[PDB]
Each structure stands twice: as C-alpha cells, then as structure tokens.
Write a protein that binds this ligand. Sequence first.
Ligand SMILES: CC(C)(COP(=O)(O)OP(=O)(O)OC[C@H]1O[C@@H](n2cnc3c(N)ncnc32)[C@H](O)[C@@H]1OP(=O)(O)O)[C@@H](O)C(=O)NCCC(=O)NCCS
Ligand SMILES: CC(C)(COP(=O)(O)OP(=O)(O)OC[C@H]1O[C@@H](n2cnc3c(N)ncnc32)[C@H](O)[C@@H]1OP(=O)(O)O)[C@@H](O)C(=O)NCCC(=O)NCCS
Ligand SMILES: CC(C)(COP(=O)(O)OP(=O)(O)OC[C@H]1O[C@@H](n2cnc3c(N)ncnc32)[C@H](O)[C@@H]1OP(=O)(O)O)[C@@H](O)C(=O)NCCC(=O)NCCS
Ligand SMILES: CC(C)(COP(=O)(O)OP(=O)(O)OC[C@H]1O[C@@H](n2cnc3c(N)ncnc32)[C@H](O)[C@@H]1OP(=O)(O)O)[C@@H](O)C(=O)NCCC(=O)NCCS
Lengths: 389, 389, 389, 389
Amino acid sequence: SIVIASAARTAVGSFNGAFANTPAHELGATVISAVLERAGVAAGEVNEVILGQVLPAGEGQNPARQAAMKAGVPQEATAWGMNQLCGSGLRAVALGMQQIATGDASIIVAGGMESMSMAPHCAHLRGGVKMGDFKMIDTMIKDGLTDAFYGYHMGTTAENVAKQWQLSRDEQDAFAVASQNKAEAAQKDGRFKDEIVPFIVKGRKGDITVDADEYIRHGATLDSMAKLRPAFDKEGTVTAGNASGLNDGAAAALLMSEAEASRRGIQPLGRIVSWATVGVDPKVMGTGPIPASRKALERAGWKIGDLDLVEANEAFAAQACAVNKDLGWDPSIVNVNGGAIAIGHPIGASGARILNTLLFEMKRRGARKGLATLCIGGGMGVAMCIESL
Amino acid sequence: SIVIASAARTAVGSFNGAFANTPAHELGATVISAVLERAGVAAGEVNEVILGQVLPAGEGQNPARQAAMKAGVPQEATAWGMNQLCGSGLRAVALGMQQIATGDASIIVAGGMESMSMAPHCAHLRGGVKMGDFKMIDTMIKDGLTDAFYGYHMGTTAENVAKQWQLSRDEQDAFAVASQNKAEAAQKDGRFKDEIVPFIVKGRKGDITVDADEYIRHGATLDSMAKLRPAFDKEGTVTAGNASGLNDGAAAALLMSEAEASRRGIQPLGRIVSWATVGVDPKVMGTGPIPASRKALERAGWKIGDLDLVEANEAFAAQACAVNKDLGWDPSIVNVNGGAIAIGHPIGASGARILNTLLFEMKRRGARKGLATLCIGGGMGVAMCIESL
Amino acid sequence: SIVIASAARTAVGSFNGAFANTPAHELGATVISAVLERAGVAAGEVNEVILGQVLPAGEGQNPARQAAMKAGVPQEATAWGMNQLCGSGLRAVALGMQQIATGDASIIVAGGMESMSMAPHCAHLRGGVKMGDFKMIDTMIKDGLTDAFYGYHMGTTAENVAKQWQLSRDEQDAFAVASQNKAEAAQKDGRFKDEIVPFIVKGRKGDITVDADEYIRHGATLDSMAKLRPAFDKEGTVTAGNASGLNDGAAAALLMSEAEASRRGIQPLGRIVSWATVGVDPKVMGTGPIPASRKALERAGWKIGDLDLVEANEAFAAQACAVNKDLGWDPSIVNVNGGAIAIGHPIGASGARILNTLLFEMKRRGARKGLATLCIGGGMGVAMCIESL
Amino acid sequence: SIVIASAARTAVGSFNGAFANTPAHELGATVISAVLERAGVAAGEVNEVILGQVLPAGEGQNPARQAAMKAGVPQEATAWGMNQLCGSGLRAVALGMQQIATGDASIIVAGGMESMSMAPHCAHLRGGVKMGDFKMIDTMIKDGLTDAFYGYHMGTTAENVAKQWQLSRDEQDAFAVASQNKAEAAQKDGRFKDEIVPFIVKGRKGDITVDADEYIRHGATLDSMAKLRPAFDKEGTVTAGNASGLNDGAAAALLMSEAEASRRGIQPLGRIVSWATVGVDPKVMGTGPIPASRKALERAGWKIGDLDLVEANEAFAAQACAVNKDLGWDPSIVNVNGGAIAIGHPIGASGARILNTLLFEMKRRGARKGLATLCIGGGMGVAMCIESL
Ligand SMILES: CC(C)(COP(=O)(O)OP(=O)(O)OC[C@H]1O[C@@H](n2cnc3c(N)ncnc32)[C@H](O)[C@@H]1OP(=O)(O)O)[C@@H](O)C(=O)NCCC(=O)NCCS
Ligand SMILES: CC(C)(COP(=O)(O)OP(=O)(O)OC[C@H]1O[C@@H](n2cnc3c(N)ncnc32)[C@H](O)[C@@H]1OP(=O)(O)O)[C@@H](O)C(=O)NCCC(=O)NCCS
Ligand SMILES: CC(C)(COP(=O)(O)OP(=O)(O)OC[C@H]1O[C@@H](n2cnc3c(N)ncnc32)[C@H](O)[C@@H]1OP(=O)(O)O)[C@@H](O)C(=O)NCCC(=O)NCCS
Ligand SMILES: CC(C)(COP(=O)(O)OP(=O)(O)OC[C@H]1O[C@@H](n2cnc3c(N)ncnc32)[C@H](O)[C@@H]1OP(=O)(O)O)[C@@H](O)C(=O)NCCC(=O)NCCS
C-alpha cells in the first residue's frame, strides 16, 4: 500500500565545515526539490512536508515550512517538524506513511534535516541576573547529546553499553576502521552518487557545490585509532575515532500509495512493509535497536534471516557491535558502504540519511528485503522494514 | 473507532507569572498523570507520549520523554515532540489517533506543553564574532512569533486580516471584552474545574498550588480597552487587549480505540470523527481555520449547522472575527467560556487546551457534535471534529 | 602649597537602587559642577579632571572626559580615569595634587565615580566557541571584587584577616551595628547635608531628586545581624551585615595651590600635608591601611596621637577592627558619622567619598588634623593627611 | 632630574594574531622584566608600576598589579592602571616621572599594555530584558574607538580632519605606503631588535617566541592601497589601508632620578625635559598633537627646529598629515622607522610603544633632542620632550 517513490539526501558536512553557516531548511529545501524531480512529481502536488529536526533554535518559525516553501511547495500545503532525537529522520517517514494510510494525504515528503553547526548558545534571561556569572548554554550539547535523566553525554551511555557487553577498545576500534574503510570504498566507487543531491553553498566570493561526504576519512589506520584518548570517560573506551561525529545534512523521501506510483509510471525504491518504535533504559539507550528491529520484523512477518541488507546507525562503535552481536544478523549485510562513524551523524536527519543509503543500495545490488534502525537518546529505538518492487 | 477516554490541562499561567521558572515537561508530567488517573489507566499501559511544543530550546533532550518518565510512564513506552506552531497541541491528538488507527499502538497520551517564560535568548557563536556588536535573540519571538517569510510578527499578520476584512478597532475591542467577560463568567461558576488539574509549583520558601487561569481579567472594561495603543502597527488596530497573550500551560488527552474504552468500563469524552490541516497565505495566517474546519466537516460528513459547540482559537480579535464571519456558525456556540485572549495562549499547548474546554463543555451541556480549530503561523490551519457517545 | 578648595559627593545609592540605570559619568558630572560652584570657580578655569573608576566597561570612551564635558569643562581642558581599585577615589586627589606640585596644572578636579549597578556581563567571543557552554562573566565581580592571584572574593581576604587577628563574629557584628547607628544618627542630625550635592535622576514619568544615602539602615538590630549566614566561607564569620555593600555614587574635590586659593578669597577645606600608598600580601589586603597610614604620618611628621579625626574605610568589619587594633588610634575619632558598612561602597568613588566625610566633619567640629585611609584588593593601602587652615 | 634608565616593548601583534589569546598583563610582565634586566635593576627595588590600559574588561582586578606580581615586583610595592585613551602609554611615563619629582617614589616602571584581541562583548543584564532582542556590545569598539559625544568612530573624526585640511585620498595613501616601506626597511635592517623584548606565547602544542612586528606589510603597493574602499564614510577617504590597525602589545620604561642612575652607573636612554597634555574639539581629535607638542616644546624652552627626531603617532594618515602640516617639522625626522599604520596601534600601549621607538633610534643615530606625541579620542593630545645624556 504505501511506497517510497524516490529519495535524496545532501552530502554530510563536517562540523563547522562545508555547511558551517547553512541553515538546515536550506539543506532541506534542496532535498525536497530533489525527491520531487527524481520522481517526476510537481511541488504543487505535495500535500505535506514532515521533517525531523532536533536543534532548530533561532532558525525562526517552523523550519519545515520554510524548507517546503523555499522548495516551491505551494502555501496551500502543510509542513511540520518533529523530534524523536536521532530516530527523528526515520520516524518522519513512518509518520508520513500513516498520513496516506489513514487517507488524510496522498503525497508526502518526509525525512530529517539538521545543522548542528548552526545550533546557537542560549540563556534564560527574562528575570535578569542581579549578580554573578551565568551560563550561555550550547543547545547542541544540552538539547541533542545530553541524557536528560542522568545529566551525562550519550558517549557515557555508550560506555555503559561497552562495559555491559564487555566490548574492548580494540574491538570498538576495529569496527570503526572497518566503517571508514567501507565508506571510503563506497565513495571512490560512485556508490554515494545516486542518493546524493549536490547542494550549492551560496557564497559571496564564489559559490561552492558540495556533492561528497566530507567527514569520511581516507586511509584510516588502526594505529592512529589506538592512540586516541577516551572522550567521555577519562579511563574509558569510547574515543572521537570510534564514535560518530557532529555534522550537518538533510535527507528525505517522496511517499505515495503504491497505486498512485503505478498510475504515474514511477518505479518505487521500496514498499514500507512495517516500522516499530520501543523504549529501553536511558542509561543503555544504545541497545534501542534490538527490540525495535525485532518488533518491526514481527510486524512485517519477517525473520532476521529474511533480510538481504541492513542499515543500523553507528552512534558509537560499542553500541553498534552490541546490536549486531545481539541480533546476530550477518555482519556482511550491515552498513555495506560504511556507517555514521565515517559518514557523520546529523541528528535529526540521520534516520532519513540511512534510509537513502539502504534504498539506493537495495536497488543497485537487487536486494529484496531491507531494514534501517537507529538507537535514540533517552532510551528508545526505531526500525523500518522495506521490500523492493 | 478512536475515542478520547479522558483529558486534563493545567491552569494557563501569565508570562513570567506563576509558571515563570517551570520547565514545560514538569507541567506535561502533571497532565499526563492526570489523564491516566482520570480514566483509571495505569502509566504502564501507555505505548507513547506525543507532545507538541514549539519552544524547547534549553530544556534538554526530548522534553516529551522527560515528561513521560517524570509522570511514571515506563522506559519501555516511547515519546516524541512535534511542532506545527499553534496547531501543535491539536495536531498531536490527531497523530496519536493515527498511531492507534494503523495498529501501531493501543494507548497514547497526546497534547502539548509550553513554557514561553522559560524560552531563552540565543546567538550562534561557533564562528565567533571578530569585531562589532551582535544581537541576542529572544527565541520565543524569533522561533515562535515571527513570520519567517516576511520577518514581521504574527500581530502584523493580524493587521493584514483586519484591513482585508474591514474589522474596525471597536469591533475587535468588543470581541475581546466579551471573551474576558465570558472567561470570567465561566471561571466564577466553576466551569473550568473539571478540565484543570492543579499544578504544584515546587518552591523553597513555600510550595504553591496553581489551579486557576491567572491570565483572565476580572471586570474588563471597554473604556480601558479603547485607550490602549496598537502593539504592532503604530497606527494599527491590534493591541495587547485584543490580542492573545504570552503564556505557559500544558494539556493532554488519553486516546484508545472505542472498543478498548468499552473493555475498560470508561465513559469517553468523545470520538474523534475527523481532523484536517490546510495551508493558506502566511500573510493572512489568521484565516487558517476557515479551510481546515470546512475540510474537517467535509471528512466527518457534517454541515456547519450540525455543530453544537465550537472552540476556535483566539490568536487575535481580528482573526477570530474573520473566522466566524466567513464560516457563519452561530456565535453563541463558539468559545462559550471565553478564549485565548482571556485565558492565554501557550503556543504548543493551546490546541490541546481548547480541546479540553470543548470536551468538558460538551459533556456539561450535553452537546453531541463539536469542533476545535486553530490558525497556525506560516499560513496553516488545523481542525478536529468530536462527537460524544 | 596644595589645598582642597571645596568638595562634594552625591548621596550613595544602593545596588540596583536609586541609581540603578545611571551611568557613573552622570553622577561625576553633578559632583564636578558642585565643586566648582562651591568654590566660586568657573568650569572654564579647570585644567584637568581626574576620576578613579574601576568598572567603566560599556560606558564608552573615557567616562572621565564625558563627565568633564557634561559639566561644562571646556574642550581645551583634559580628563583621564585611573584605577587602583578601592583606593582610586583617594589616589586621584593625590595625583591631582602632584599635577599642581610639579607646575603642570593650576586647577584640578579629582575624585572617583562608580556605577556598580551599571557594570555589565561579558564574554571574549572573537575566537568563537566551537562547542560547549561558556560563562557570561559579571564584570563587577571579576574586575572589581575577586582577587586575581588566589581567585577568591575580597570577603575571603576578610576571612583570612578575621582568623589571623582572632576577631569573632560577635565583635564584627558589634562593629557593623555601631556603624549603622552612627551613620543613622549623623543622617538624622543633618551631618551629611553639606557634603551631599543632590542628584536628579532624569526620569520619563517623573524626575527624582536623590539627596539621602539610601543604604544606611534605620534601627539596625544586633539580633538581626547575628542570625545572618556567612556570605563567603560556609562556616565563616563575614556576612552581608558586617561587610560593605555594592553601591553607586561619585565624589570629588577641587584642588589648587594655597596661594591661588588665597588670591581668590577662598577658605579651603584643608591643606594636603601628605599621602602614601604601600603594598601588603593580597591574602590580607584588608591590612593595607596599616603601613599606608603609618607612611603618610611619617611623611607628615605626625604621630598617630596628633590626629583629631580619621576616616578608615569599612570594606569589612573584620579588616576595619584589625586596622584600628594595630594602629591604636582612639576609636571614638574614627568614622564618627558611620562608615561604608552603612553608607555603602562605590569602589572607585569611595576614597573621595570618605575624604568628603572627613573634610566636612573636620570643618564642623573644628578638628585640625585628619587622615583618610582605604584597603585595596590585590594587597595595597592608600592614606592621606589633611590639616585645616 | 628624571631619566629613562632603560625601556622595552614587545613586538606588536596583529588583531586576533600572535597574541590573540594573551591577556595584556602577560605581555606587560615581560616588559616589566625586560626594563629591569636592561638597566641592572632588581625587581625588589621597584616602588610602583603604572600601566596605561584602555580595555581591561574581563581581565580581573587591576591588571597593572597582575603584571607587576608576575614580574616578581614585591607585594610591598604598588601598581595601578590609568586611561587617557591613546595617550595612556605616554601619560603613564609622565605620571611615573611626577612620582619621583615629588619624592613619593625612587624607582618606577611606567608604560602601557593592551590586548584589543582579548577585549570582550558585554551587556548590562542586571535589570533583566523582559522581551525582545538585545545587543552584545563589542567593548573595543564602544569603549576604545567610538567618540562618546558624537557617537561615531575615531575614523569619522579622521574624515573630518581630511575635509578640513583638504587632504586627498592620494596624499593619504602615499603617506600610508611610505609608512609601510620605512617600517619594512627598519624591520629588515634590524632597527627594531634593541627595543623589542621577545614574548613567549605559551603553547600546549608548542611555545612560540614572538620577536617581530607582524602587522608590518612587506611589499605594500600604492595600487592595492588605492583600490581599497572607504571604511567609515561610504564616500570618504579613510580606508583600512591608511588607518592604524587593531593590535596587541605592551611597552614600558624604567624611571629614576638622574642622580640615582649616576650612583648606579647607568647610562640612561634620556632625560625627561617636559611633557604636556592639551584638549581640542572631539570632532577633530586627530589634531591633539598640535597644541600638546607646542606646549611641551615651550615648557622645554625649545623651538620646533631644535628637535632632532620626532615620533608622532599614526592614528590615521589624514590626521598624521594634518599634524605634520601645521607643526611644520621636517618630515624626514618624523617616524624615521615607520609608524602605527604599519606597526600597529594597541591603544593603551602605543604611547610607550612610540617612546621606545623614539629612544632607541635617538641612541642609534646620536640624536640629542626628540619628541613623542599622540592624538587622543574625545579631543586631546599628549607630548613629551626627551634629551640625551
Ligand atoms: C566524540 C566527540 C565528543 C569528539 O568531539 P571533539 O573532541 O571536539 O572531536 P574532534 O574531531 O576534535 O577529535 C579530536 C581529534 O581526533 C581526531 N580523530 C577523529 N577520528 C579520527 C580517526 N578515525 N583517526 C585519527 N584521528 C581521528 C580528529 O582529527 C582531531 O584531531 P585534532 O585534535 O588534531 O583536531 C564528538 O564527536 C561527539 O559528541 N560526537 C557524537 C556523539 C553523539 O552522542 N552523537 C549522538 C548519537 S547518540
Ligand atoms: C500584544 C503583545 C505584543 C503585548 O506585549 P507587552 O507590551 O510586553 O504587554 P503588556 O502586558 O506589558 O501590555 C502593556 C500594558 O497593557 C495592559 N493591558 C493588557 N490588556 C489590557 C486590558 N484588557 N485592559 C487594560 N489594560 C490592558 C497591561 O496591563 C499593561 O499595563 P502596564 O503598561 O501598566 O504593565 C504580546 O501580548 C504578544 O505578542 N502577544 C501574543 C500575540 C501572538 O502573536 N501570539 C501567537 C499567536 S499567532
Ligand atoms: C556581602 C555580599 C556578598 C552580600 O551580597 P548579597 O547576598 O546579594 O546581599 P544582600 O543585600 O542580598 O544580603 C542578603 C540579605 O541580608 C540582609 N541584611 C544585610 N545587612 C543586614 C543587617 N545589618 N541587618 C539585617 N539584615 C541585613 C539583607 O537585607 C538581605 O535580606 P533578604 O535576603 O531578605 O533580601 C555583597 O554585599 C558584597 O560582596 N559586599 C561587599 C563587597 C566587597 O568585597 N567590596 C569591595 C571590598 S574590598
Ligand atoms: C580600519 C578598520 C575598520 C579595518 O577593520 P576591518 O575592516 O575589519 O579590517 P581589515 O584589516 O580586515 O580590512 C583590510 C582589508 O583590506 C586589506 N588591506 C589593509 N591594508 C592594506 C594595504 N596597505 N594594502 C592592501 N590591502 C590592504 C586587508 O588585507 C583586508 O583585506 P581582506 O578583507 O581581503 O582580508 C580597523 O582596522 C580600524 O578600525 N582601525 C582603527 C584604529 C583606530 O581607530 N584606533 C584608535 C585611533 S584614535
């Protein structure tokens, strides 16, 4: 019944890098237009735009709506943002699928968008500060990466999972290197080109077109990896090297009923067979994908063994290993072209980013069943099952 | 099919007033536990919490999850925030309804929360400011009350509707006084008591229980109304007295299938018969409710005249008069107990606030069909049809 | 040789009190004007204006010049600010005296001004913060009241004195209360009237004339003093009651040679017979007055017993008791009209403020020899000897 | 009677350049140490440190003391900051001269220090900002470079000077370029090494020794100067190229009586024969050096023509030309090694920076009579006459 007609994602920028001064809606705009062009659908036919975005402080009213208009979706359509933190990008797509499923909409553009670079610093200053210093809060750290119940960073949650699952430094380092190597491989081979829609960084002293994931590191060594210091736990195991990064980017999908696609001559990227969201302990939020993935499979009537390709987000090597280890899926069909440790992790957009990767890889290799999953801070998981047509 | 088993809202506080230093998720928690208590449903049976909230900057990771956990909803359920500006609160109820409708969940707590008071000032400072003054941005104004396309305040959008619908100052002023008198009348007769759930302002030098809408003004006079100066257009017609206020508040509804309600012996506040969202020109966003309410009515199979009760959000006097003028519904059955001009307008929570009033009024006067509707910044409208059982 | 022809000070404002939004140069202007007027001297005859001021951040270019110009001092004259912390106001007069002494000026206006209320919060943001919160530093605290070598407040230096000299809480409290009672008595008898020049707080909704020290507490009780908690050392002895306050004000003196005063028919407030500044350990900065007073007396050819009156600044009860104890001067001739615990402490202005108090009470009671001294953060003292004519 | 026994200055840093994050007191300490070393004078014999500094906000209590204590001056000695804007650095040495003159000290360290780069942004937030955006004020611009009466930059006073003296853009640029080329040639020949004491910028990933004036431009061309846009008056004449820069540095002199230097066997850098400070119209502040230099020369009993070397600060090419045109001194003996357009303008230090320059060059060519003068914001000038021994 509901299918992904087309899809597109911008390249992933490094922190304060290529998209350093680009507002997330800009990145979104471009992705909205791309999904539209790639399927032959006119913006005028878009009913609603849903965009997962975790840090929009200071971008103005509802960046989802700004993105949609910038791209040309008429003012008669609707737009909104939503936040399930890292699962935002993937959840948006589910939510959009429900819009068509309940007959409230026909065509939806959904995904995520995020400019971690552009997240501001803030302070509550309405009462006034009579005396003494006050903190100017980094909304990126406070609103997107800090557990609100234990007050510590996601990296600490990762450390909790490492200890629990007895995942050594070498084993988390091994996983990261492989991720880099696979992402680099995929980049060289043209593997990211279909899914990437080039973005034009509007300059003054010149325009710059970005069309390659700039965070991927070429020739990542195990030696450099092993020399890094732990980033969260002073005598910890998680490092800048075996953890995803801070990044900017956008990604989305054009959804419509399978029938509609058919009436249009569109060859869909896949059929949304099922999706699931489940909570877990915030302290070990990285385990999220276990229950969520299993729930999704259950709802789809699929067995883990049925999957031909998987995209399980790499928030941290320790959590990625734990997930794989627990689920037991064949490592070889998970993050085939690299994961977030190499590609980057634009919070609100990452679920749609990985959906794009999964979808273009399933088409290129001819896989039939796929699943995308992500862990969520605060202790949640989100998963989606896709079947090719 | 999907029914609102129960509902609850906090009192709406004034700006920097009773809830001045209360983070939205604390009010959210209170309301979520009320709805459970009220229906006789255990926190453990909640699948997900959906909370619209337009201004979470500074509150920490996903305040929706923080509300849920604080209220006792286990770590197993899931939670998420969403933004459709002033339509957030109502929209969230519709999205939860769809969670159930598609069989993804059984029981959802939905609504919105907002702390305008706690909205911080911010500035993007990662790049640094090498020389020169820079502006500290009020995020409530920028991210909540400023049109992103024309750069002006919602108040100006109100002025655009005023001029277009030829709504004089005296006519808006009249409308405002009536809403105050009607909000004061209803407060005096205990008409807001079922819906309100007292909120304990945790103090140090005393704990204060808030259970009354503090923003309503007792004895509002037309003379005082007519002496106020225009707040947005220097030679304008919109003023502080005929515009909604800056407020805090949280409201929610407990949703489940009609059959489930029946299995539990619950007496539902009503069945969600339909809902809709439609866009309009951002310049005259106040018109939002016209196209959305009609759509909602159309999807429900109802005529405007079928409606027994109506709650149409009082963003601004200008817009409310325009809405009523166009739709033509009998004025006496619209905002019977007063509106946002008197009660307050906690952006992200207002759509669920007005559903509460609609729902407890419908039960108290035995009205069968009702409709809630709100105008949304950026040019959008949201509407919902509820029928009692 | 060099005399003080006239002097004047504004009443001392409470923190965020009467002068909450008055820039220090405005208060300085009025005192410049008063001193001129009081001496029969025209602003066109001033050669230079010298004003200590420790916290001028945000006031604009050299506020000493802004004060001079506001007062009508001709653009041909010159102005400069200086900072020797709490000894600033007194040091200026010394430096003004030396302008005359060396023949480079004939007529100087010298004193101090300080708006502790208008001191701003700041941050160095040229480089940008790539991530993480940063502090907004209270400049009042940082640049005015925090020792730069040990990182702690001036109050902690008070605690180090308390301990070392074995001054109990009780003794400190007794000192504070006698300060209050004496200042209150002098206020009520009209003792502060000759020295205060009334300041007009330019309002919108009315102008307010301030001509009374508002910080002096009427009816101060020992019981209320003794229940206060330690302000700097959780199990300390220094409290808000026994410490000076945070205050606003300005004060100055018009200087010229004795022979010039005589050609003008002026009866001068006194002859500057000597002055001195000496350092001590920063940890016990409050002991500054000891060596500076002893040095001034020696330069004057005076024994301690020759003094008729003394003004020794009350930075803190603890340090004031220590200075009196060590010096051994008759306590009844010290701060006879109350001191800074009661009157307040506008840092840059206080040395000139207590020099006004000394001058006008030496005239009133016919005291022939007087000395004014103040303790300075960072470990310094300043003292000056005055002889009537 | 009072001689400059030795002197020293750091190299001048570019804005956010080599000393981007070096607090001024650190650079002052190194200059304190250097004067001491250069004269065979131990830090224990210093009585007082006087350092001009215009922008100390956020550096902590009295940076002159912090510099003195870092250099090892005993805690028994004293220190203070003063501010007469751009003539601060020179005013201080006149001020130190006066201490010895009047017998209050025997050995003084005086000069100035500034780090424009470390100046912060601020806001007065004590009263609170109920709502709306507020300004974060660059203290360098506001407190250092804007006229307090006319509200415009020091550069617009430059434009005023340009029109009034009819100084074309061409004349300005050619003085600018000749400044650059003489500083480049004295840099290259080694004429700045005697005056400069190397500064070690404490690294983490390496200590950096800074011993060269980095703002100096090598190969400055008339053509690229001529292509620059006006910086203050959109259709003006003052550009970035013919105006001084924004810089960092410190500079000082060690003073004592001529008799004292003879008892120690010190061959002094000169005798301070006179100084003068005079005001002028704030709108043409750049003309300050005119009356100040004539005044100093008359107190010295010298004719303009007796001077052998002159250092006249380059605030802007337009005022520099005006000052040279009126005084009429031979241009060939003015700033023979370049000036501030090329070397840099750390406001509080500049006066002392150009005295060093003066001093060293009078020594090297055997000049007997020299003068150092500087224009001061707010309408003022300072100048000093030096005679070799
Ligand atoms: C891990 C984290 C704290 C690192 O932040 P940081 O310290 O500012 O990161 P950096 O990139 O500066 O790391 C420091 C260095 O490690 C180096 N580094 C990173 N990966 C490397 C690799 N694979 N090999 C070699 N060096 C590497 C960087 O190049 C850098 O070198 P430098 O110090 O010379 O600049 C941050 O990326 C983070 O919080 N990430 C995401 C975590 C998260 O919770 N995401 C949400 C998911 S739940
Ligand atoms: C209208 C608005 C700009 C007013 O802001 P403000 O100037 O800070 O408001 P205030 O409450 O201070 O109004 C000033 C005065 O009006 C007075 N006032 C308000 N309503 C009044 C009435 N009915 N009768 C008499 N006086 C009244 C207040 O009491 C106050 O008196 P004071 O000056 O002695 O304090 C603000 O309410 C606003 O933007 N509101 C919401 C509009 C909006 O866009 N909502 C989103 C919906 S799309
Ligand atoms: C001591 C100090 C830290 C107090 O700051 P604060 O805590 O914000 O001060 P407050 O005025 O709020 O004092 C707190 C309370 O004590 C009370 N209080 C003060 N003196 C009192 C007295 N004599 N009797 C009774 N109550 C008294 C105040 O009235 C107030 O009551 P409240 O809590 O109901 O408002 C501040 O004054 C300070 O730093 N002072 C001296 C500064 C200094 O170092 N200056 C340079 C000297 S080198
Ligand atoms: C004049 C002023 C505003 C320039 O500030 P800015 O615009 O940020 O300065 P910059 O140095 O970035 O701009 C100069 C631009 O022209 C270039 N430029 C400067 N001098 C040049 C020269 N001599 N030849 C060629 N190009 C030159 C700079 O490289 C820069 O080029 P870029 O932007 O491509 O990198 C600032 O330096 C100033 O305010 N100086 C004032 C000093 C003052 O008032 N002091 C107290 C005086 S009383």
